[PDB]
Structures are given as C-alpha cells and as structure tokens.
Amino acid sequence: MERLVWDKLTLLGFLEKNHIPQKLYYNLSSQDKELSAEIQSNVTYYTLRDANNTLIQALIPISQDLQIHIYKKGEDYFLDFIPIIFTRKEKTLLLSLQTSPYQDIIKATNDPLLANQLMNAYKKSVPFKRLVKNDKIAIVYTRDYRVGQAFGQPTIKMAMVSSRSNQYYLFSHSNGHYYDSKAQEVAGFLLETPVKYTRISSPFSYGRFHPVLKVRRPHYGVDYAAKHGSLIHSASDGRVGFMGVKAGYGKVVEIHLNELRLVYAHMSAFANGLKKGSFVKKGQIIGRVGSTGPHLHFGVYKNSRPINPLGYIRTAKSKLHGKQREVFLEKAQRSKQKLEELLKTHSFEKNSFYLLEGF
Ligand SMILES: [Zn+2]
C-alpha cells in the first residue's frame, strides 16, 4: 500500500476525489457516521490502487485501534470499521539531562509525543522549566508499530523525575487515571456534566474485536438523551478550536484545554457571541441540544485519544482505597525496586541516556 498523510480531507471529500459513490457514507448508521467524523488530520493512512489508478483499498484511522476499511469487490465499494493491526513494544528510558528535558527526551527516543506527554503529566508537580543538568528522568512506556512504522501515541506506564533532591513518580492504572506514590491521582482533571439528561443513551466503549460473536463497535463519547431545548454547558475551561458542521456530528463545538479536546455534537444552536477563538469557562453555556430523538454526543480526547468522559465527571480527584490500593502499592513497590536496579546497572558516566527493551 502507499503510505500517505491525511491533511485537509473529510470522508465525503475522499470518496468524491476517488469516484466512490457518497451513498457509501450516507447509508451508514448514525453511530457509524459519528465514528467517521473523527478522522484526524496528520494521520498516516494507506491506499491501494490498480494499474488504472483506481482506488481498490483504503485504510483510514479513526483512533489508535480502529480504522475505516474501504474496498472494491467487482463493481461495488464497501466500507467496514475494523481493528488496526499493530505490534506493541515496551521500552525503558533512563536519562540524565544534558540540556533541556523536551530536547533531550527527543534526542534519546526520536519521540516528541513522549516528551510532551511527560511534560504535561508533571506540569503541576515538576515544571520542566525547573529541571537542570544531571537531573534524572526515567520512563517505562509502550509504543505501537504497523509494518515497522511507529504510529499513534505512546502510553506511559511509569515515570520518575528527580529534581532538587526529590523523586516524583507517576504510575498508570487500568482505570485510565495516573497516580503518585501515595495512590493519589496526578495530572487528571475535573469535569462537569454538559447537559441535564434523562439517561445515557449510549455509553463510551472501546469496542470488542474478538471472538466474532462478542464483537462490539467502539463508541468514542457519551450520548445523552435530553429534552429539546436543553442548554449545553462546557464541561471545562478552554478555548474554542472549532464551531460549525461536520458530517456525522451536525453542529459541533470543540474546545481545547491543554492536552484535552472536548467535543459537543448534534447541537441546534451555538451561544450568541461564541466563535472560533473564544475562551470559555467551566459551566458556561455554549449552545443548545439538537437533533442534528434529541441527543448530545460528548467526547473527551486526552493526548489525541478518546477516553471515557464519565471517569472525569466528578468534584474531586481519584484516590485509591481498599484492595485496589494494596494491589496498586505492591505493584508500585516492585516497579520502584526494578527501576532502582536498572539505574544501578546503568551508569550515566558511560552514557547520558539508555533506551532499553522491556522493563
Ligand atoms: Zn455518540
């Protein structure tokens, strides 16, 4: 296949460019239309053409784990939503700073997304502006590969940053939140429900891809059933990055807050004065619920990846308890011992970074 980057196109633009009847999109269920509206610019996608230059296959990412597969059989085009095929590798970075964190992490890994994720995750506990030469940074993380090419975002499993005689740890959890050495949440956020709802008509789901009888489509936000006219509130502070129509979402507002993007779709109207560029405060009215039943699709992206918004709708951060805490801390202990060992057996006099396989 040709490997290409997406840039300006929408799904309907891509179909027209390639003489694929647009009914391939319009016949989709509304849920599939919603999935189709999150083709991000800058994503690597893949195409196969015949000796007449006719589009025979395209694989276009919707998320890190799901893609649109367009393909031609005989005279007909088909469109499925299917798993992205990939390999997952775990790495451990041991770094002694020589200049600047962002810059040195990139020099050691070629992975600016990793650098930026770490900076954001620590921004309220160790500002990177604070770090100096010979401070230490460790990161255990996974990276995904398709046919030898890295794609998507890394995921941090653990990190340790040392500054001013202290070590500051970050540990992932299966619940999606990150925690410090005390099993207290770090680098999260507090969201408000964006609409007064009757029920959640469709919850968030990562989907299920095997075995065949268990297969379930992902849904990368929360669909709220709400009475016609309901006002929509921003779940957070932020800045409006998009306001308008996107096929599959109808009228939609997107708000950016640091590494977050919040999506508010199927609206009837935007709030007077609101435009691209506006700053908004948590709870501020941004528009009104539409049927473009009446529903709001609320999406939350963290480091460009959809996450279950309901885990963040709360008035205080997460802190583990009970057996969850016992198990978390025992795992954290063993992680800490292993990192200490790796740091023993890896002198920074020889090399100012090491990039190791596994952990
Ligand atoms: Zn939805």
Numbering used by the authors: 41 to 332, 337 to 403
According to the publication:
Among these, only the N-terminally 41-residue truncated Csd3 (Csd3Δ41) comprised of residues 42–403 was expressed in soluble form, and it yielded two different forms (the orthorhombic form 1 and the hexagonal form 2) of well diffracting crystals. Chains A and B are related by non­crystallographic twofold symmetry. Chains A and B are highly similar to each other, with an r.m.s. deviation of 0.67 Å for 359 Cα atoms. In the form 1 crystal, the two monomers in the asymmetric unit bury a relatively large surface area of 1130 Å2 per monomer (6.0% of the monomer surface area), whereas the largest buried surface area in the form 2 crystal is 710 Å2 per monomer (3.8% of the monomer surface area). In form 1 crystals, it is involved in crystal-packing interactions by forming sulfate-mediated salt bridges. Interestingly, the side chain of His339 of Csd3, the first histidine of the HxH motif, shows two different orientations. However, it is flipped about 104° towards the solvent in the form 1 crystals.
Seven cell shape-determining genes (csd1, csd2, csd3/hdpA, ccmA, csd4, csd5 and csd6) have been identified in H. pylori. Among them, Csd3 (also known as HdpA) is a bifunctional enzyme. Its d,d-endopeptidase activity cleaves the d-Ala4-mDAP3 peptide bond between cross-linked muramyl tetrapeptides and pentapeptides.
